[PDB]
Amino acid sequence: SVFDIFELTGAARKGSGRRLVKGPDPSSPAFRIEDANLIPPVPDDKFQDLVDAVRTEKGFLLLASLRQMKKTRGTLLALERKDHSGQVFSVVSNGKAGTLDLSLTVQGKQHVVSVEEALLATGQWKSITLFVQEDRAQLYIDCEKMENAELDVPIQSVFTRDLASIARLRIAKGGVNDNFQGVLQNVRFVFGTTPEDILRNKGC
Amino acid sequence: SVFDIFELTGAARKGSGRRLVKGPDPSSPAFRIEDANLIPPVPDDKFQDLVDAVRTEKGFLLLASLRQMKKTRGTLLALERKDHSGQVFSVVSNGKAGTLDLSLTVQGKQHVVSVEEALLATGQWKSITLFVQEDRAQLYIDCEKMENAELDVPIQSVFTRDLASIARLRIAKGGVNDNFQGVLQNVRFVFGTTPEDILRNKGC
């Protein structure tokens, strides 16, 4: 029902890619990224559960609290091929374009869509609620007007049955100079819940 | 019933005397001390509650997980006079003597007792359970033989009705070069519970 990515990676391990810091959630640890390459990937079996949940729902709700350096491109999370030939999926807070970029690669074909009006790199804590279902993307920043975008392919087409055997979930690690610069907290995949239910318990 | 000192001080505040790190308790934050002087004292009202609990019980059970530099003297916690003329109470892991020193000052008269056979400064995580009642002190390190010591005065005689108005609870801050050097976690005063109940749920 709820997959906190940092928890899964076991992210809290002494000084391996990040510094444990303060977050807007007094009850959870926040990580200031230092070397995303060192933050361990989500374990295969623990990733396999996410895959199935996504496949059951034909989508997911992703929540995240972030504090990102201005005008930078930071990968929130990505699915990288075990062979290292690239990524099959990624979510990037693009501070250069003022967007949240969603990339999906379906056997060679990579498709990228930008959710416009998404300034998440304003050096302060921001919280996002991204709802994805089939080929539809809905984004809510804090308590603001929702932004929408269409995927050229259904999200589940990326989350194949065997995905965990050929790819792994990484957090804060990008492709071309896209590692996340800043602080991340409660990056979680929530299932069996629509976006309204969530914003309903943030001042709105 | 339970007073976690770091929580009370609001100890978790961005980089004010300590670095948030890993502890043997996966569910709680551990603090590596950097400048105890900057770790805020326990708020008066929140301290007033501790005082009354101690006064009701005529003692307390103190628990603590610590990782202390070898052969150093580190104050785990202390009650310092608001006027700055000294301490009225202190608990010191004395790595030089291999003891846990308990100091109590009752109007000028300072009394110090050492709980012998207490090597807590062996550079590794150690956990302590100190039970104090009236003038009796009992210490249990991890799951080891208990050590005992007698106080020249009842513990409640230090915890007067008005103590919170003339003194404040500090953590990791000592008197004569006694700041704690290392990492501290779950330093808590537990009430309405005897020591056995505690060790009963650590492998012993």
Curated annotation (Swiss-Prot), chains A, B:
Tree of life domain: Eukaryota
Record domain Laminin G-like: where: 37-204
Tissue expression summary: Expressed by platelets (at protein level). Expressed by monocyte-derived immature and mature dendritic cells (at protein level).
Region (Heparin-binding): 19-67
Cell location: Secreted; Cell surface; Secreted, Extracellular space, Extracellular matrix; Endoplasmic reticulum
Description of how the protein assembles with itself and partners: Homotrimer; disulfide-linked. Can bind to fibrinogen, fibronectin, laminin, type V collagen and integrins alpha-V/beta-1, alpha-V/beta-3 and alpha-IIb/beta-3. Binds heparin. Interacts (via the C-terminal domain) with CD47. Interacts (via the TSP type I repeats) with CD36; the interaction conveys an antiangiogenic effect. Interacts (via the TSP type I repeats) with HRG; the interaction blocks the antiangiogenic effect of THBS1 with CD36. Interacts with ATF6 (via lumenal domain).
Membership in a protein family: Belongs to the thrombospondin family.
Protein role: Adhesive glycoprotein that mediates cell-to-cell and cell-to-matrix interactions. Multifunctional, involved in inflammation, angiogenesis, wound healing, reactive oxygen species (ROS) signaling, nitrous oxide (NO) signaling, apoptosis, senescence, aging, cellular self-renewal, stemness, and cardiovascular and metabolic homeostasis. Negatively modulates dendritic cell activation and cytokine release, as part of an autocrine feedback loop, contributing to the resolution of inflammation and immune homeostasis. Ligand for receptor CD47.
Protein name: Thrombospondin-1
UniProt source species: Homo sapiens (Human)
